[PDB]
Amino acid sequence: SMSVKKPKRDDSKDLALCSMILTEMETHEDAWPFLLPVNLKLVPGYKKVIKKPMDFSTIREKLSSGQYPNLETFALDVRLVFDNCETFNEDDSDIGRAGHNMRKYFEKKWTDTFK
């Protein structure tokens, strides 16, 4: 509350460390469904159904331009990519499996770097 604060966690490396995680996600062999925004002209149903599209190149641009206020808003966009994927793709599909794999890969790196 006013003039009452928990001890200050060092967040000075968070930007660099999110960048590193994101590089690892970009270079994973199962990243291909997620590298670029889904083409809303060429994929029927996507625009209407997925209210907030997100992809790794959009997260990279937001990160590089100071549009994440803190490490939690970064994680929320990464998770949005996978939540969107599950919304639109059957689990038993190459893309559906890719999303599950990448979400696991992310959540481990996230826990190991920050928890």
Swiss-Prot record:
Give the UniProt subcellular location, in the record's own words: Nucleus
Q: Could you say which tissues express the protein in this record?
A: Expressed at varying levels in several tissues, whereas a smaller transcript was expressed specifically in testis.
**Signal peptide per UniProt:** none
Write down the superkingdom of origin. Answer: Eukaryota
Domain (Bromo): give its ranges: 9-113
Q: Which family does it belong to?
A: Belongs to the WAL family.
Instruction: Kindly state the subunit structure of this protein.
Output: Component of the BRF-1 ISWI chromatin remodeling complex, at least composed of SMARCA1 and BAZ2B, which regulates the spacing of histone octamers on the DNA template to facilitate access to DNA. Within the BRF-1 ISWI chromatin remodeling complex interacts with SMARCA1; the interaction is direct. Component of the BRF-5 ISWI chromatin remodeling complex, at least composed of SMARCA5/SNF2H and BAZ2B, which regulates the spacing of histone octamers on the DNA template to facilitate access to DNA.
Q: What does this protein do?
A: Regulatory subunit of the ATP-dependent BRF-1 and BRF-5 ISWI chromatin remodeling complexes, which form ordered nucleosome arrays on chromatin and facilitate access to DNA during DNA-templated processes such as DNA replication, transcription, and repair. Both complexes regulate the spacing of nucleosomes along the chromatin and have the ability to slide mononucleosomes to the center of a DNA template. The BRF-1 ISWI chromatin remodeling complex has a lower ATP hydrolysis rate than the BRF-5 ISWI chromatin remodeling complex.
Question: Under which name does UniProt file this protein?
Answer: Bromodomain adjacent to zinc finger domain protein 2B
Tell which residues of the whole protein are contained here: 2054 to 2166 of 2168
